UniProtKB/Swiss-Prot annotation, chain B:
Mainly expressed in stratified squamous epithelium. GO terms for biological process: apoptotic process; heterophilic cell-cell adhesion via plasma membrane cell adhesion molecules. Induction: By p53/TP53. A beta-D-galactoside binds at W69, G70, R71, E72, E73, R74, G75. This is Galectin-7. Could be involved in cell-cell and/or cell-matrix interactions necessary for normal growth control. Pro-apoptotic protein that functions intracellularly upstream of JNK activation and cytochrome c release. The lineage of its organism: Eukaryota, Metazoa, Chordata, Craniata, Vertebrata. It comes from Homo sapiens. Monomer. The keyword Secreted applies. Keywords: Apoptosis, Cytoplasm, Lectin, Nucleus, Secreted. It is found in: Cytoplasm; Nucleus; Secreted.
């Protein structure tokens, strides 16, 4: 289950849009999208977006110096085993707006500097159709 | 055909706002528009006028301020077709508006009016509107 990696050569800014389309496999337990601050294993995560099919929830968090912050959770779980999905992660000045299925889902206020984000990683139990940066 | 469609934005929009517009260009369409307007009055100032012209095969970008239009900019050819559906994103940044069409970057329009002046999104002209969403 190797995680997908896409570099952000000039990082991201208010107005950057990450569009991720995929399918949750029928036996899926969980998957994630990470906005990381570099290529090092264990690099800080400005945003950890973690749909959990097994525990019926979506967890948001950040990671800094190897320790996880306090979890935030969205309402319910807008993902279904066997079903395709489209997520938008939109950077603004205040944080990240996660859009799922054409509806605003959660707003994660910035914990780390947005200028530190350099890499998108997608891992876990997910079939990745496309990652696009607008 | 959902038109003219108005989405009021009383709190305005900021950098990181995404306007997703989907619809059908009907068989004999001449042109349609997406306007980011500064108020509800007729002839209001426009931070952005996005104007696909099927009849002349151009896409024009412009602004209107103090009742006067600015200098038009033009995108690269026309990524719309009579009889075909489309998906547009208009993305606001600190610097301007990025127009995405069919999942490909199409044009960047540098801000001419302060983004903070925008109060309303209007869609009109020869388009059968599917959905207008603002994130």
């Amino acid at each position: 289950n190797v995680p997908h990696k896409s570099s952000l050569p000039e990082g991201i800014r208010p107005g950057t849009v990450l569009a991720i389309a995929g399918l949750v496999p029928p036996n899926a337990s969980r998957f994630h999208v990470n906005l990381l601050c570099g290529e090092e294993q264990g690099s800080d995560a400005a945003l950890h977006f973690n749909p959990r099919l097994d525990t019926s929830e979506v967890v948001f968090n950040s990671k800094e110096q190897g320790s996880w912050g306090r979890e935030e959770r969205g309402p319910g779980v807008p993902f279904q085993r066997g079903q395709p999905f489209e997520v938008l992660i939109i950077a603004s000045d205040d944080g990240f707006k996660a859009v799922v299925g054409d509806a605003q889902y959660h707003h994660f206020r910035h914990r780390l500097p947005l200028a530190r984000v350099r890499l998108v990683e997608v891992g876990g139990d997910v079939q990745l159709d496309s990652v696009r940066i607008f």
